[PDB]
Curated annotation (Swiss-Prot), chains A, B, C, D, E, F:
The gene is MAPT. It comes from Homo sapiens (Human). The tau/MAP repeat binds to tubulin. Type I isoforms contain 3 repeats while type II isoforms contain 4 repeats. Interacts with MARK1, MARK2, MARK3 and MARK4. Interacts with PSMC2 through SQSTM1. Interacts with SQSTM1 when polyubiquitinated. Interacts with FKBP4. Binds to CSNK1D. Interacts with SGK1. Interacts with PIN1. Interacts with LRRK2. Interacts with LRP1, leading to endocytosis; this interaction is reduced in the presence of LRPAP1/RAP. The lineage of its organism: Eukaryota, Metazoa, Chordata, Craniata, Vertebrata. This is Microtubule-associated protein tau. The modification Phosphoserine is found at residues 1, 20, 48, 52.
């Protein structure tokens, strides 16, 4: 015979305090950008990205994160 | 016979205090960018990225992180 | 017969205090960037990145991190 | 008595030939430009120029130049 | 008595030939430019120039020059 | 009495020939430029020049040059 008891406990806390947030600046790609092409052969798929792309500014007033996994597995 | 008891306990705290956040600057790619191409042959896939791409500014007023895994596994 | 008890405990604390955060500057790629290509053959996959790419500014008011693993495993 | 004769002569020529003119490029000021000021006192006249100013491109298909002066003076 | 005769002569030629002019590039100021000022006192005149200024590209298809002065001066 | 005769002669030729002119590059100021000032006193005139200024590219297809002076003078 088998007896399995799984009764974990958690009273934990994750916390922050901040007095103020501000005066934050992000300026990607201020210079001039220039592209020239002549006499090219492509016999297969092409992708191109030119300029100011995919840039992020992220300013959360907290931004705390908790991750928890439980995983019983049996035969 | 088999008798298994799994009863872990957790009272943790994760904590921060900050008096103020600010005057933060990010400026990628201020210089000029220039590309010239002539007489090229491609017989297979091409990808190209030219300029100011994928840059991140990230300013959390806390940003604490707790990660936990439990993993019982039996036969 | 087999009789197993697993009962760990945790009363830990992870903590920080800061009087203020600021006057932080990041400026990648102020110089000029220039590329010329003539008479090339490619029989194979190509990727190209030219400019200011993938740069990060990261300024957490806390940024504490806790990682924990439990792993009982049986036969 | 006075007898003065001034009778200069000139049969001279200035000449050019060019087979073609072209593919000329001028790109002043491709980089980013940035100016910040705090707590300044001025008790007299000020001038300021900021940016891309007073630049010239000049492509004459000839541009030959002859200057001549005759300057008699007497008492 | 005074006799003066001034009768100079000139049959000169100035000449050029060029097979072609081209593929000429001028790129001043590709790098980033940055200026910060705090706590300054001025009690007299100020001039300031910041950036890309006064640049020249000059491509004459000849550009030949002749200068000539005649300057008799009597008493 | 005085008898002055001034009769110089000139049959000069000044000449050039060129097969072609090209592929000429002038690229000043590729590096980043940066200026910071704090706590200065000026009781006198000020001038400032910061950046890429006064640059010249000059490509004549000839550029031949003749200068001449005649100066008779009396008492």
């Amino acid at each position: 015979s088998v007896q399995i008891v799984y009764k974990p406990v958690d009273l934990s806390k994750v916390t922050s305090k901040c007095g103020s947030l501000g005066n934050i600046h992000h300026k990607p790609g201020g210079g001039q950008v220039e592209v020239k092409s002549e006499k090219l052969d492509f016999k297969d798929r092409v992708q191109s990205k030119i300029g100011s792309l995919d840039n992020i500014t992220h300013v959360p007033g907290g931004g705390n994160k908790k991750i928890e996994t439980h995983k019983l597995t049996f035969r």
